[PDB]
Design a protein around this ligand. Structure first.
Ligand SMILES: [Cl-]
Lengths: 8, 108
């Protein structure tokens, strides 16, 4: 499925 | 290890976790739980309510108990949670998706 990405 | 915390639900499914944090609608913005990953064993997930929708953030727990979320390192899962109670989770959608962790779903 899909997991969140953080701004880096 | 994590079974002493009330917000840890162990091996619950992604769908069950989503429904738990979505049950109270957008009023529960920021409500969260932590679970074992369902699609990558050994890993963990922070599942949280964002404007009524469930979101899922992968967590890595080292053998020493420390917690990594992508580029961010914390001494413990508890420290990660307290950090995101005080500062917004830096998601890609920026200010339109502002969220700080608030309450948690208590495990049954
Ligand atoms: Cl650290």
């Amino acid at each position: 499925p899909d997991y969140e990405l953080l701004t880096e | 290890f994590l079974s002493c915390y009330p917000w840890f639900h162990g091996p619950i499914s992604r769908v069950r976790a989503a429904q738990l944090v979505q049950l109270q609608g957008p009023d529960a913005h920021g409500v969260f739980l932590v679970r074992q990953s369902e699609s990558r064993r050994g890993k963990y997930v922070l599942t949280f309510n964002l404007q009524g929708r469930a979101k899922h953030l992968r967590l890595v727990l080292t053998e020493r108990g420390q917690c990594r979320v992508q580029h961010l390192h914390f001494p413990s899962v508890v420290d990660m949670l307290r950090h995101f109670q005080r500062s917004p989770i830096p998601l890609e959608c920026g200010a339109a998706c502002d969220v700080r962790l608030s309450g948690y779903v208590v495990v049954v």
